[PDB]
Amino acid sequence: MCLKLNLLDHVFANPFMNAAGVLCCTEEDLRCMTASSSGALVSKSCTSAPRDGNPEPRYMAFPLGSINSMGLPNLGFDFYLKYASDLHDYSKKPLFLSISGLSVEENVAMVRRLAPVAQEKGVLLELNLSCPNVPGKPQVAYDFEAMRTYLQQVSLAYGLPFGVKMPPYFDIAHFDTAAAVLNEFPLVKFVTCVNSVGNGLVIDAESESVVIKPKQGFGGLGGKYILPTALANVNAFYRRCPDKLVFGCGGVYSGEDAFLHILAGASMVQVGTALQEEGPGIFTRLEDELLEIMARKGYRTLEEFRGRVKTI
Amino acid sequence: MCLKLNLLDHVFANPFMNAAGVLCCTEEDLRCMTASSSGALVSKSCTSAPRDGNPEPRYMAFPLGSINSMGLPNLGFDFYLKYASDLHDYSKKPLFLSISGLSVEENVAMVRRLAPVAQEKGVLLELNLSCPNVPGKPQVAYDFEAMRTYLQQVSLAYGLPFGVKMPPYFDIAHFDTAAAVLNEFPLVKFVTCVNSVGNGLVIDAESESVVIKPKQGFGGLGGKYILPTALANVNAFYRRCPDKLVFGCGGVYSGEDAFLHILAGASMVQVGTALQEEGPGIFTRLEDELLEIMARKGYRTLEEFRGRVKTI
Numbered sequence: 001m002c003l004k005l006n007l008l009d010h011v012f013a014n015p016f017m018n019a020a021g022v023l024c025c026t027e028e029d030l031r032c033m034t035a036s037s038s039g040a041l042v043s044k045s046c047t048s049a050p051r052d053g054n055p056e057p058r059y060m061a062f063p064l065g066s067i068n069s070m071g072l073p074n075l076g077f078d079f080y081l082k083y084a085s086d087l088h089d090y091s092k093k094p095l096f097l098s099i100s101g102l103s104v105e106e107n108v109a110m111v112r113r114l115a116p117v118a119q120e121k122g123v124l125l126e127l128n129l130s131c132p133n134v135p136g137k138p139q140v141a142y143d144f145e146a147m148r149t150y151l152q153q154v155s156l157a158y159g160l161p162f163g164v165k166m167p168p169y170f171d172i173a174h175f176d177t178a179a180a181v182l183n184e185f186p187l188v189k190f191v192t193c194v195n196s197v198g199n200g201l202v203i204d205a206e207s208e209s210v211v212i213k214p215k216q217g218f219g220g221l222g223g224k225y226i227l228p229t230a231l232a233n234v235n236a237f238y239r240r241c242p243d244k245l246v247f248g249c250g251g252v253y254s255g256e257d258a259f260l261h262i263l264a265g266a267s268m269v270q271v272g273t274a275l276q277e278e279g280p281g282i283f284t285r286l287e288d289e290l291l292e293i294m295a296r297k298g299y300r301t302l303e304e305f306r307g308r309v310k311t312i
Numbered sequence: 313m314c315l316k317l318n319l320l321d322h323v324f325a326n327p328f329m330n331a332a333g334v335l336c337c338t339e340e341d342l343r344c345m346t347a348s349s350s351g352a353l354v355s356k357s358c359t360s361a362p363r364d365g366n367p368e369p370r371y372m373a374f375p376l377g378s379i380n381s382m383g384l385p386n387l388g389f390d391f392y393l394k395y396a397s398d399l400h401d402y403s404k405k406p407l408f409l410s411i412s413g414l415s416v417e418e419n420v421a422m423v424r425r426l427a428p429v430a431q432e433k434g435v436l437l438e439l440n441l442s443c444p445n446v447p448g449k450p451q452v453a454y455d456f457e458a459m460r461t462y463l464q465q466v467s468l469a470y471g472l473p474f475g476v477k478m479p480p481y482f483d484i485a486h487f488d489t490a491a492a493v494l495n496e497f498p499l500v501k502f503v504t505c506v507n508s509v510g511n512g513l514v515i516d517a518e519s520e521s522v523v524i525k526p527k528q529g530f531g532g533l534g535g536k537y538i539l540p541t542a543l544a545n546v547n548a549f550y551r552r553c554p555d556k557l558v559f560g561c562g563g564v565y566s567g568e569d570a571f572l573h574i575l576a577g578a579s580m581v582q583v584g585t586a587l588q589e590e591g592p593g594i595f596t597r598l599e600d601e602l603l604e605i606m607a608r609k610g611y612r613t614l615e616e617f618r619g620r621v622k623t624i
């Protein structure tokens with residue numbers, strides 16, 4: 001038994017990949033992810049120009065997960081585009097390129113240049129509408145009219161299939177509205193749920209201090225803290241977007257957590273905090289653990305249980 | 313060294329109280345909370361008429377917290393008003409009465425009748441604008457115009473100091489807007505941050521099923537999952553509402569957790585999931601643990617460290 005699957009006209013050895021931003025900023029990082037046993041990889045969310053990002057310390061991990069305010073430190077779109085066009089070995093695994101412009105115009109500029117490389121190489125766009133860490137830049141997908149504008153303009157400029165990295169929602173009406181906006185756009189072929197639970201605050205009791213420097217300590221949460229939130233979002237969008245794929249992201253540390261994401265509706269399963277903490281060895285463990293659970297339950301394929309979470 | 317507080321023209325032996333909804337639905341529950349070592353208690357969020365609530369199972373707890381979709385089961389406003397008027401021993405500790413009408417009209421109806429009892433007895437209103445569990449009723453305070461309408465109408469009909477139970481927010485722009493709305497209302501004297509992290513989804517791996525029955529398993533999250541979210545909201549509103557009090561709620565299991573809430577700006581500290589799981593003995597433990605931390609740090613009163621979280 002193997003975990004191989006086909007999605008978006010690509011073949012994947014297994015459903016696992018890094019979450020955008022983790023182990024994917026430099027050429028070294030991307031080569032490392034490519035050498036790993038992951039089924040795919042995604043690059044660091046990029047901007048038109050290189051960015052230093054927010055002041056350090058800007059990432060901290062704890063038993064229950066992580067907090068960060070990276071601020072989109074990245075080598076610039078030119079680099080990630082070059083990686084996709086010239087450097088990536090597509091024989092190894094598919095590549096997603098994440099973009100996170102600070103305006104609709106910036107995203108449009110990037111996708112116009114990405115299009116020919118997508119046409120030639122088959123790199124897949126993940127449009128980030130949920131960066132919660134750039135000062136003065138609210139999460140785009142929390143403003144439904146802004147989200148519609150971004151998707152209209154990107155759809156028109158790109159003209160090719162793409163996906164969207166979504167923030168978590170916490171309100172049924174918001175699931176309804178957000179999914180309806182996404183459903184307006186036939187080029188949106190996948191929906192990645194979720195980005196960090198935004199603007200949490202970790203405080204150290206001994207020092208009586210916040211643990212990250214940017215934004216007075218306020219940063220995106222990932223890891224164990226967010227698994228039920230992530231599962232809810234995966235399932236909410238799976239139910240509401242029956243003609244799209246949902247990629248699960250949030251709180252994956254084990255094959256069991258991945259199994260839950262897939263039960264909720266996930267096609268691919270992304271790994272952030274746990275990968276940052278454990279390193280790329282995690283991918284062999286996740287594959288082994290997922291296969292073990294499947295074997296115990298008598299499941300032979302991912303399709304046998306994807307989206308088959310039971311209700312009472 | 314002492315945990316005493318004097319706020320809202322009341323005296324509190326310590327900052328601890330139940331979170332609304334936990335151990336506070338029946339007369340038995342309220343007498344139990346009154347007999348406990350807590351500094352105060354709050355009644356179950358009530359509606360004009362009694363409610364059975366959502367179908368069971370509707371509460372489930374786990375190592376990292378709880379999920380619920382109770383659906384405002386309550387004995388009805390008449391009962392809680394009678395409790396405040398005739399039954400509560402105010403010589404023991406202050407009482408808060410939580411209301412959660414399903415419309416602005418229902419809330420107005422209740423506060424008109426509460427006002428003379430508040431005037432006579434000193435019962436304190438907590439207005440719930442963040443119930444995430446009634447099917448078809450989105451969280452009021454996620455709609456800023458609805459929130460303003462509710463606060464305008466309740467302010468006019470009630471005419472007395474009250475507080476508001478707020479949902480967690482996850483974006484800086486939302487903290488900014490929400491706090492600005494609250495600041496329009498001089499009668500809002502306290503802000504309780506936070507209600508449950510709404511519409512999470514816990515799935516049991518063995519049974520492949522959601523763990524609660526209502527809303528296809530979607531329920532409010534509390535406990536360890538939500539502490540950094542709760543701290544962020546407490547601090548965000550503490551910073552933005554310098555002329556109001558902030559009550560902390562979310563993820564409190566220990567005196568250390570309470571210490572963090574207080575550093576973030578909390579006056580009272582409410583305990584939900586941990587109280588539901590441990591029972592009212594938790595209050596003596598929380599008091600001992602908070603006093604221990606204060607002793608180690610040389611703090612003699614809560615005011616010496618309230619809101620004194622350090623940034624980098």
Ligand SMILES: Cc1cc2nc3c(=O)[nH]c(=O)nc-3n(C[C@H](O)[C@H](O)[C@H](O)COP(=O)(O)O)c2cc1C
Pocket residue numbers: 019020021022044045059066068070072098100128165194195196221222223224226249250251252270271272273274276
């Ligand atoms: C260090 C750090 C950097 C991240 N950078 C990005 C980013 O560039 N783009 C993006 O869409 N998400 C980014 N994320 C969010 C993750 O992709 C993921 O959505 C989140 O961490 C939740 O998954 P987890 O619980 O496995 O950590 C970042 C997260 C962290 C921890």
Ligand SMILES: Cc1cc2nc3c(=O)[nH]c(=O)nc-3n(C[C@H](O)[C@H](O)[C@H](O)COP(=O)(O)O)c2cc1C
Pocket residue numbers: 331332333334356357371378380382384410412440477506507508533534535536538561562563564582583584585586588
């Ligand atoms: C069983 C259950 C019932 C609740 N009922 C109410 C309610 O009636 N009104 C309210 O404002 N919050 C209610 N809550 C939310 C809690 O007051 C609290 O905001 C939440 O549980 C987060 O705190 P915690 O992490 O200590 O559990 C309820 C929570 C649970 C666990």
